[PDB]
Amino acid sequence: AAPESFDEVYKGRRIQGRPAHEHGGGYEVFVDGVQLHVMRNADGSWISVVSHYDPVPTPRAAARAAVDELQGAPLLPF
Amino acid sequence: TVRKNQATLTADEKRRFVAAVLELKRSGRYDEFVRTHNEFIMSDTDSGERTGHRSPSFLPWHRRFLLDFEQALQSVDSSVTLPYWDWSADRTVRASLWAPDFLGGTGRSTDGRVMDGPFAASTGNWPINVRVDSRTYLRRSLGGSVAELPTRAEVESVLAISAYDLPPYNSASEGFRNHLEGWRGVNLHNRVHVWVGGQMATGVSPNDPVFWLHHAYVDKLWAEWQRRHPDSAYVPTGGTPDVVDLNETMKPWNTVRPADLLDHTAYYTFDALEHHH
Ligand SMILES: [Cu+2]
Ligand SMILES: [Cu+2]
Ligand SMILES: [Cu+2]
Ligand SMILES: [Cu+2]
Ligand SMILES: [Cu+2]
């Protein structure tokens, strides 16, 4: 059962999530309109391709961790 | 054919390892390793097909992947072998690993940029091409996102686990493989990726040459586990959906099985590896 969608500006960047070469994913995240690959683990935690080894509780937390990782840099599409 | 602790390499060995890595990068061969790893990282899932990690085949897959990379290095300089980083022993930013004559040190604070060593962006010799974060320079934040590397006592606690792996054969598993991988428990391999930071914390983690030394030590720990548990072996052993069973072939090679990779001594030995006691 999918997490809720979200939309906010986090550290100056627009992060969005929504239920929907890489897995068939039930949830999409975007950083300034560029899709960020994210993945859910069996225990319900989430990761993203820019923070793959450090599970966080929700897709929004993964989007925020991606903005933190990027330090302002644009994301490239997968 | 001997894999040595990084801390013990001679100046000549460090130089030749570095120069072979830089030549694989220059010729374009290096980045395809980065790309293969990212494809499995992004595709492996806990409830679907899973081969390169979060699964029993995490260990044999990385063993073969590292063999492919070591063979490419040897195609450039046949004297070079993969060194390993015992992050339980060499656990500070002061380790010789991180010196400018080997891998260079941590990233500066502003932008995580590695400023020294042969892989610093300023050299012009280490462009980050296969990437998600759009920046093109090597980044690290040693000890940034997590305080400490695993200790010998914590590694020993994982080595003590008798079952190789357990149903459901994924990130929720109990058993040796998942505790070494780190998704459950005190956390060994995942924590090391987090501790280095920069590209090592991402799905394009072979962008950092320390990737190979980390995984060579993870591979050594599998060998130590086998010595501690000569009675325990790879599982599952047949007919498991979405998981590579013992005698099933593995992507992307398709021509090798976990069974063909359990015994490392067919391909290399270690500078030191205890006998079962
Ligand atoms: Cu996907
Ligand atoms: Cu990996
Ligand atoms: Cu545990
Ligand atoms: Cu890894
Ligand atoms: Cu015995």
From TrEMBL, chain B:
- The residues the record assigns to binding Cu(+) 2 are 189, 193, 215
Binding-site residues, Cu(2+) 6: 189, 193, 215
An MF annotation (GO) of this entry = oxidoreductase activity
Which residues participate in Cu(2+) 3 binding?
37, 62
**Where's the Tyrosinase copper-binding domain?**
53-70, 208-219
Record family assignment = Belongs to the tyrosinase family.
Write out the entry's keywords from A to Z.
Copper, Metal-binding, Oxidoreductase
Needed cofactors: Cu(2+)
Name assigned to this protein: Tyrosinase
Q: Where does Cu(2+) 2 bind?
A: 37, 53, 62
Q: Which organism is it from?
A: Streptomyces castaneoglobisporus
Record keywords: Ligase included? no
Q: What is the lineage of its organism?
A: Bacteria, Bacillati, Actinomycetota, Actinomycetes, Kitasatosporales
Q: Where does this protein hold Cu(+) 1?
A: 37, 53, 62
What residues does Cu(2+) 4 bind to? 53
This protein's source sits in the domain of life called Bacteria
Q: Which Pfam families does the UniProt entry name for this protein?
A: Tyrosinase
- Quote the record's binding site residues for Cu(2+) 5: 174, 179
**Which residues take part in binding Cu(2+) 1?**
37, 53
Listed transmembrane segments: none
